[PDB]
Amino acid sequence: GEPTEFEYLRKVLFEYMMGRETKTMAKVITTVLKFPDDQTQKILEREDARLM
Amino acid sequence: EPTEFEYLRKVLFEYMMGRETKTMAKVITTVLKFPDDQTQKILEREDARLMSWLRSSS
Amino acid sequence: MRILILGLDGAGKTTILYRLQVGEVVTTIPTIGFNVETVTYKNLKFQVWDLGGLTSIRPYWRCYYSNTDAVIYVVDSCDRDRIGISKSELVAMLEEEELRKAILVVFANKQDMEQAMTSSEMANSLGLPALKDRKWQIFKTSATKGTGLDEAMEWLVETLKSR
Amino acid sequence: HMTREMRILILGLDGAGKTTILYRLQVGEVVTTIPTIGFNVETVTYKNLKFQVWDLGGLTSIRPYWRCYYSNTDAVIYVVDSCDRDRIGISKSELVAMLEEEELRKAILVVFANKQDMEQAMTSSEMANSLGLPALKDRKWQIFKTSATKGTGLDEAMEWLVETLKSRQ
Ligand SMILES: Nc1nc2c(ncn2[C@@H]2O[C@H](COP(=O)(O)OP(=O)(O)OP(=O)(O)O)[C@@H](O)[C@H]2O)c(=O)[nH]1
Ligand SMILES: Nc1nc2c(ncn2[C@@H]2O[C@H](COP(=O)(O)OP(=O)(O)OP(=O)(O)O)[C@@H](O)[C@H]2O)c(=O)[nH]1
Ligand SMILES: [Mg+2]
Ligand SMILES: [Mg+2]
Asked: Which residue in D38, D41, D69 is closest to B7 by CB distance?
């Protein structure tokens, strides 16, 4: 059995990569994948800087 | 830990930081076994972003 | 308005979402991810997020908390063994700064069953009378039959309309 | 095109020496490595030309991801451990598979028969035969004896790659 995180990430990453609810999906991705806190900070700072 | 998590973190970090995004989008959609319809939509969208960058002066 | 539907797996979250959207029972599978639909009640639109409740994915619920106006917390009234789990998830979530001002409605679901706990036991087990600085109410629901939903939603909407 | 930054992939089975080669090319020395679960990409300067060189991890389960990186590839450096007699057939089948990809049609192939400093190393000729290289009619290819640790053969292999790229139709 595939780790269930894969199914979870397929849904989250599809949404994110299609530009839908990207700040939320970025939080989820960085959490699910257990990124080191410094990388997470960098990723979420760049997400916030996306101009509408 | 799944081998794929370490791999996905390296790849997602580059993607989310805006580096080599097309290549990374191909990798992410392959690793996570996305269906080809969704993959082509995602890749079409990357190609459109790069097309809008190449044709804009500013 | 943004609403989260939370609760353990099997509680009836997804069944409630589509009962609210299309007034019918739908077949479900365990939600490994989320469902999102906009729902129209009393000429008003809510974006409702139904988050999966399986053990391995419960920890990701907090990722979705930013800008939440209300939580519908769905509890299987027949599941006496895991009401303690629901209570610990409810305590943990209400400590989150992002939900400081959120309205909490608890749906004591599966009240169509004879094995259902009463609204009263459930409030006590969930620690609801002890909650401070919180607007909250509990309601008896059956997502399959349809009972209690229209009335819980009347309360949530009016409470949201009043701040 | 010689003027412009070109793209090289370094591929091959885990343990072949890919990451060691990448950094010997970039900084001129042997560095300590771990198993690459991902990739390393570095800008490499060779004969004052700039290469975007991608060193992709060779563990079995992440080899299916190699093809994701094939777009716009000018050259593949295919690294083969000259002492691994048990897996030369696996190196062969991974090579056969990648050379079917349309994304790689334009790419030149340079095979580094690596770890030739070792006593039990297979000869270049035995390896070329084992990999099926003489059957690659439609592919510009050459095989070179190399040692990433001792530096031998790298400059000659790279000189051939650069001459071959310059000669492209
Ligand atoms: N008897 C009865 N069964 C219900 C009721 N509501 C939902 N169910 C059933 O409970 C089971 C689980 O319902 P779901 O809606 O999929 O549960 P969920 O909370 O979304 O579960 P996850 O997706 O894992 O988080 C299904 O078989 C439903 O038909 C109810 O009010 N009464
Ligand atoms: N004797 C000898 N050892 C080498 C040579 N090249 C690499 N090695 C050693 O072989 C081991 C594996 O080398 P790497 O560079 O990590 O192998 P890799 O191909 O990058 O492997 P993955 O990252 O799993 O794809 C290391 O201990 C290197 O020092 C060589 O030419 N001669
Ligand atoms: Mg569900
Ligand atoms: Mg390596």
From this structure: D38
C-beta of C77 in contact with ligand 1 (< 6 A): no
> What whole-number distance in Å separates Cα of residue B5 and Cα of residue A29?
11
Domain C2-163: assigned CATH number: 3.40.50.300
Task: Give the A window 5-34 contacts with B, CB below 8 Å.
Answer: 5-6, 9-10, 13-14, 17-19, 26, 29, 33-34
Instruction: Check if the beta carbon of residue C71 is closer than 8 Å to that of residue C103.
Output: yes
Q: Residue C34, SS3?
A: strand
| CATH class of the domain at B1-58 | mainly alpha
Task: Decide yes or no: CATH 3.30.360.10 for domain A1-51.
Answer: no
Residues with Cβ within 8 Å of D40's Cβ and at least 6 positions away in sequence, in order, are: D19, D22, D54, D55
Residue C75: strand, helix, or coil: strand
What is the distance in A from the centroid of ligand 3 to the CA of B42? Answer: 26
- Contact of D68 with B23, CB cutoff 8 Å: yes
Cβ–Cβ under 8 Å, residues C68 and A43: no
CA D12 to ligand 2 center in whole angstroms = 11
**What distance in Å separates the CA atoms of residue D158 and residue D73, rounded to the nearest whole number?**
16
> Which contiguous run of DSSP H or E holds residue C71?
strand C70-76
CB contact under 8 A, B38 and A6: no
Eight-state DSSP code of residue C99: G
Residues with CB under 6 A from ligand 2: D 12, 14-20, 33, 35-36, 57-59, 114-115, 117-118, 147-149
Closest by CA position to C105, among listed C130, C128, C133, C136 = C136
At what resolution in Å was this solved? Answer: 1.7
- Which of the 8 DSSP states describes residue C9? T
- Please give the CATH topology (third level) of the domain spanning D1-169: Rossmann fold (3.40.50)
C42: left (phi over 0), alpha (psi -120 to 50) or beta: left
Which approach determined this entry? X-ray
DSSP string, chain D: --SS-EEEEEE-STTSSHHHHHHHHHHSS-------SSEEEEEEEETTEEEEEEEE---GGGGGGGGGG-TT-SEEEEEEETT--TTHHHHHHHHHHHHT-GGGTT-EEEEEEE-TTSTTPPPHHHHHHHHTGGG-TTS-EEEEE--TTT-TTHHHHHHHHHHHHHT--
Closest atom, ligand 1, to C-alpha of C29: 16
